[PDB]
Amino acid sequence: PKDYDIEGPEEVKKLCNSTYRRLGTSEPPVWISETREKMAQVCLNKALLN
Amino acid sequence: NLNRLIGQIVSSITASLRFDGALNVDLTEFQTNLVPYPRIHFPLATYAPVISAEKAYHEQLSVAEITNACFEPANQMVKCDPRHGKYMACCMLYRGDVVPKDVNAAIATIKTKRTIQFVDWCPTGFKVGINYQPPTVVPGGDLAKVQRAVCMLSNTTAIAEAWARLDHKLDLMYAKRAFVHWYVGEGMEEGEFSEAREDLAALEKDYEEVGVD
Amino acid sequence: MRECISIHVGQAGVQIGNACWELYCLEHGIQPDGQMPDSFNTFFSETGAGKHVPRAVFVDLEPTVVDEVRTGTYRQLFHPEQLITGKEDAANNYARGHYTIGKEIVDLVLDRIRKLADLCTGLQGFLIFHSFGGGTGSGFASLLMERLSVDYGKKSKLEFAIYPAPQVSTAVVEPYNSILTTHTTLEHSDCAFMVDNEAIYDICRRNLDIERPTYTNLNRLIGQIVSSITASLRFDGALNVDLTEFQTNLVPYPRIHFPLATYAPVISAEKAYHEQLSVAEITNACFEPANQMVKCDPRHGKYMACCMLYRGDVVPKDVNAAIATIKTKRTIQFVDWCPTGFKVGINYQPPTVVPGGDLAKVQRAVCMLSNTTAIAEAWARLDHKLDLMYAKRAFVHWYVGEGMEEGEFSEAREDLAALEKDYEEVGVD
Amino acid sequence: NLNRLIGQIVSSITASLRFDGALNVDLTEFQTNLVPYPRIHFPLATYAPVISAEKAYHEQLSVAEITNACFEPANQMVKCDPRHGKYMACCMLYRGDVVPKDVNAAIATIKTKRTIQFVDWCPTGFKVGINYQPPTVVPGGDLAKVQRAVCMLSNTTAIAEAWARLDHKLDLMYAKRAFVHWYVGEGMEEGEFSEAREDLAALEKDYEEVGV
Amino acid sequence: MREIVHLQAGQCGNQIGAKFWEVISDEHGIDPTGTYHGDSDLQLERINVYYNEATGGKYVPRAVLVDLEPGTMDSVRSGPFGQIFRPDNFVFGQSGAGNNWAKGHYTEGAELVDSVLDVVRKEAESCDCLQGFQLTHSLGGGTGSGMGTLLISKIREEYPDRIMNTFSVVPSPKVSDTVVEPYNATLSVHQLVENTDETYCIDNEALYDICFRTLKLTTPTYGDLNHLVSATMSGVTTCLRFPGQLNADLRKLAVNMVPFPRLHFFMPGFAPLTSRGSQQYRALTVPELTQQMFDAKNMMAACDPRHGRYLTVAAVFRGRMSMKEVDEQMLNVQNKNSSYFVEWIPNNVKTAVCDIPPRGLKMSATFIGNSTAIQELFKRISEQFTAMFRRKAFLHWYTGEGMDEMEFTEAESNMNDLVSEYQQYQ
Amino acid sequence: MREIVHLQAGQCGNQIGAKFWEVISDEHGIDPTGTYHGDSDLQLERINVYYNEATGGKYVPRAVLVDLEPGTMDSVRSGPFGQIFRPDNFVFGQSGAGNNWAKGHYTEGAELVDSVLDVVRKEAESCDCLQGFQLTHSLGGGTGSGMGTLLISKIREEYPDRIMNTFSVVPSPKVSDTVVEPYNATLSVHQLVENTDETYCIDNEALYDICFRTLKLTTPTYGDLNHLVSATMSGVTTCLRFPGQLNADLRKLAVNMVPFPRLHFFMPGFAPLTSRGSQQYRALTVPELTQQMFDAKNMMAACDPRHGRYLTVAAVFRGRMSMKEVDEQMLNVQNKNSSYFVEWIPNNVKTAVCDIPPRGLKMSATFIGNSTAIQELFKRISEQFTAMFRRKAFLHWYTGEGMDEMEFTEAESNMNDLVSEYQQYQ
């Protein structure tokens, strides 16, 4: 799943560019540190005769 | 997750100042009951009913079952075995649904052990503190809601092994003058390492001389 | 901002620069008029109406070759005053063009070169095209070297020279003109790329499939190599080299400046498109005895410094993988005090095609300049032929009549005996 | 500026003789309080309270910290490590408005610590002296106005390693008789340096003998 | 919060840091025109470390670009991120160096430093609090080797207590791109050892083998190698920019790596490096970063660490990950193969954890390693230098610029002292 | 109300004053027919500083354009803004001065000064409370220098209490475009020290260096320099026309910057000068302005402040700013560099802030500075004058008008005592 092919059929080739613009595609959905995630857990949470 | 247990033992130390109990314990009490000399002020901390939220209710968590868990070497919160040395002073701070008679029976059960040894010059050995307030659970935590707990503050001469290892570590590092040039170069002279090694050797052989029978 | 000033001296200089400037107009957008319907500032000046004037001077003493170009297709391309002619040629005589004919021309040529150099922002160096066996390129160019060294000094002076061929030759007194030319090129030229006409005959017969080539078929190859040398001056690349770059990467000592030029893909349109040729093909082709363009074998000598210039679709990983085969090969020997060996330069632009030419359009190429010990054999042969002539004093009265002394040949033989001793002592352990 | 504080130290030496005080020190008094042997007389001077002209309006230094400032290794005017030698005889020359009790309290706190090592044969160790005059302020001087200054002079075993390198420095130049021809050229025996080397080796032996 | 200056010298400096600023602007959410389009508030907060805020909400990098030739300036302006740089930080010469350390250090590299110094001083007087300097260059050239070393010396003269870093491109073992490369590598290393606090040796063939072995690319570009280099360059400034459970800046890493003042030559490495077609099948777990971060072929210097001994080790971790299996793996890698670790220091590994991964990865780990196997580089360099020096090869191009042979001898003797000192711990 | 009567002299004076009136009518919002087409209310409150009130919302400027030839103000009249000028203010002459101080002062300028003085009296009686005058001219010219010096010497006598400024164009250091201009400048600045209480020196090569290096203009015309001249010319009277937290009139800048009655030669500068390609990259803060006010490249006179000592420095600020970041910056300059400031005046900097910026700019600031480094201009003019007066290179064009040699001798003497007085306070 490349983002730049330098062996392709195109003619003008730029050598300073990167084949992959980032390494991997496994990014987490939302960025949050351990401390703010684990300190936000405090915001998460008859007889017949009386 | 470690800080949760640290906060639990710290709250159990200061619980007696805020909640009513059968035996109130002040903060100035620990220094008068845990150190025999000013040169020895390194006790250990232990929380006994450290148990998960799913298997805390298949176990009978009485006072006898929870007191003898503090003396087990695997339940301690400092990686040193108490069988290396002998106990000098112990401070137990109970909590929750606890009667004093079962505390007395459980503490008297420890004294019959021969695998747990006290020093000769401390024939009494124990300090008892009882508070009514049970340990409060936190949302999304790890510990369960238990009806009683105890925290141990025990001063022992078995911590001299840790000082021996730390001093051997410094001697293995300082013998060929590693990292010293970024200590002396910022407001220090060379002789402070020898002073600290001096005082630490004094501490080690103070520890060896205290545990003499 | 990256300009260099090309100087063409003699019939060989003009007839090489014609092909060179055809290539320069073709691979830029410049028509033979000069209109275009770091790229072009280096070799072409700008006139505000949109015209482009090349930074070149064409010098010759007979008027035929240079006055032909004023009546040709490229008549409007060159500046009228930048083509310098004379009345009398040097007549294959170094003494005439160095003393009695070159005396009254150099005050105009230096004036034109200074007028060219005052329109430049940052000058990179000079390219001088001439021939050793002539009288113009041997005498007048040689005097021009010191005459411009005096007032320019530390700027680069690259030399492109037609060395005399070993077997074939077009004159009788060419040992004389080849021998006393080197009195001044040794202390004034920074580096001297040598090409042999016999070897380009052999290449045009062998690599490209033509027999009976003309001079233009040789000047086309020479212009391709010349443009490959200065390709990094004009076009962007991953590893740019300069005119001053191979003056510090090819000469270990100031008296030995004679590398060998080699262009790897020399192939026709009939033969190019039936095979692949990417990196290892052309790099292995550069280091072969057959494709060498001076009739001396590097297997005789020791390689001292090789400068490999790559052009076109080229990835540096394949460049390293191709240099692996060269370094591992035992038939290619380097001198013991150069464990490094190579200098590399990679350019984006592929070589351009020439309608009316003979080389095919290929995506990529490599040109090599390698300084080797093996040119000392050519020096020994040429000095042999000189002292074969000089003992009988053949063809000497013309030199002594045109303002020379008889002892100037003695100095030249002494200097090149010292140069041969230098070439011997460099290649010893 | 190098010499002015040395002048202040020598003025504190004669401070007990020009005015009154509580414990006066005679010139012949410390002539026996410091030198313990007929050979070992090289005491080390120390002037603890010295601050610039800008750092006086904020803090005033009391006895219990100035006395501790007398015994810290970055004060004494010979670059030898004082922890390498046990102390043998000390004299503290207190000046200015000093009550006498906090001096004995400071003495006790100096006694109980382990950094300041003493010899076994000197359980007394210290000699104190209190005057009633502070140091004067000089025109253009760098020193500040201190109400309670202390001049400290004390013998030390650690001075043995000071000239122990001076002996090796003489050794390195006596191996091939360097510079001796401007010495023996002016009427000196070429062997005279040997009968100072044996004397210095004797001095080192006596310093080692009072080390154990 | 404390802000870091970037220096670029020559073709290596300009290209490598162009890719560096591209990936930093990617990670901090900055577009090619310089405007913030990111979403997370953590992306913008510590942007003062590398960027200066302009009017209108756009950010300019804190970089200075130098070279003796004007071609690479227009080459780096025409790139995808060429418009992000300030035009007044382009400080260029009119004529080049031509692979000459002498004219890059004394003749032509001297009269232009009087403007790079002005640019650096001008930017650093607006500096709120200066932590240190970064510099990427090459030791095989005339610009990065000469002018870079001159810049390091003239900055160490002016700012003494700030941390100086250097991401240098050491010459390759097999392919030498320049015949006169040992004449520049020697005289640049001799100036590096008295003027730098941290220096990372990055080879080119090591990068080729890393890219072919891990990324499975048969023909990478130069931009890929610069991406791999700058991934480590960004991997050491994570704790200065993002929150973490165990922070470590460059000064703290320098304290826990160098035991002696003249020991600051490291070999870096990146842990997560797998092909696209084998990265959805692989579970990126904490042991799997340690298992290949400490592999002998995951080094960007061409020296095998199994032939030497590890003096100190630095491991900077990025992403959401527990602190038990970090320390457990760092202990396990020491307890098993203890023959490759010196025994006169008990702990060799320094552990830092940051809580934000690079873009595209879930967790990551950057490696800095101090080894006594780095003497295999300078032994080869000194061997080539002494083979080329007893014949005065190419020496007249050096002595004619204002030099002498004694400088060459005193540089070779300094590097020989370096290689003699390194062998004492193995 | 404090209103200013503007004066002109010569071709330089008319060409500078045209662009000055253009930019001040832009600032006050006056269309070229004379009426008011502005959007705010503060642009009409104090418009009587520079404008009179004609019939029907039309404003005429308070200027008089003076020349000895009519060919220069015809180009002013047929210009873009040439129609707002009242035609009775145009006073021209038949024959020009011919680049002759003698002709422009003694023969041709004295036959025209009665008409110009009549126009000045015509103009100054409309003042309810006149503050002072203002003149723009050049010293290398004939009618500029001579006519302006005669006008200044004549209107100082009859209006003794008022404040008179001069934005003179002092001659060239490098390449002079008048051969005789040593003589004219020597006879002119000997006039200027005795009558003007405020004088600004404008150097055309300083402007050239600014528009090349800073503004990045390839081919600047004289309008592109007159814009720069009038930017700092209109920034002086900004507190007379707009409110501010801290005001500065002409008298406030004359008292605080002239310690002795001869040292009143200042060198102006304008702070926010950005190129069009670099404007977006630069933030606009008070440190960014005060870095460039004090820079040597921004100076509009060709004397370097590193060759002398700043006697007193003024700084007038325009825009909505905080008095922090101007007060701490005026402290920071005095504390940072101190060898360039005279020690016998502790507080050397005058500060004023007006809250209405120039049009199109968020923030701006102008510099006005008294430095004893200005003596190298006077020394250069004195040596170029005595290299010509020693053997009388052009004296016949001046002696035929009734001038003697002792006029030149005493002009040289008054140059030498001025140079000595600048030296004795350094």
Ligand SMILES: Nc1nc2c(ncn2[C@@H]2O[C@H](COP(=O)(O)OP(=O)(O)OP(=O)(O)O)[C@@H](O)[C@H]2O)c(=O)[nH]1
């Ligand atoms: N390859 C190549 N060689 C040439 C060309 N023209 C001339 N030569 C070489 O030049 C030699 C002949 O001498 P020239 O250089 O022409 O002498 P010249 O420049 O005319 O000077 P004069 O003879 O004095 O007029 C031949 O041996 C050729 O090798 C050319 O167009 N191509």
Ligand SMILES: Nc1nc2c(ncn2[C@@H]2O[C@H](COP(=O)(O)OP(=O)(O)O)[C@@H](O)[C@H]2O)c(=O)[nH]1
């Ligand atoms: N990995 C990598 N190497 C580079 C890059 N640019 C240049 N080089 C290397 O740098 C060396 C040449 O540097 P050089 O041109 O002499 O730098 P200079 O000092 O500015 O002339 C060559 O060996 C290249 O392999 C790059 O972007 N990435």
Ligand SMILES: Nc1nc2c(ncn2[C@@H]2O[C@H](COP(=O)(O)OP(=O)(O)O)[C@@H](O)[C@H]2O)c(=O)[nH]1
């Ligand atoms: N800086 C600057 N100088 C100018 C301008 N216009 C004219 N000059 C200068 O004015 C001088 C000549 O003025 P001149 O015509 O002789 O004045 P006049 O004859 O007295 O009216 C020359 O030195 C020019 O440099 C301008 O717009 N800007």
Ligand SMILES: [Mg+2]
């Ligand atoms: Mg001919």
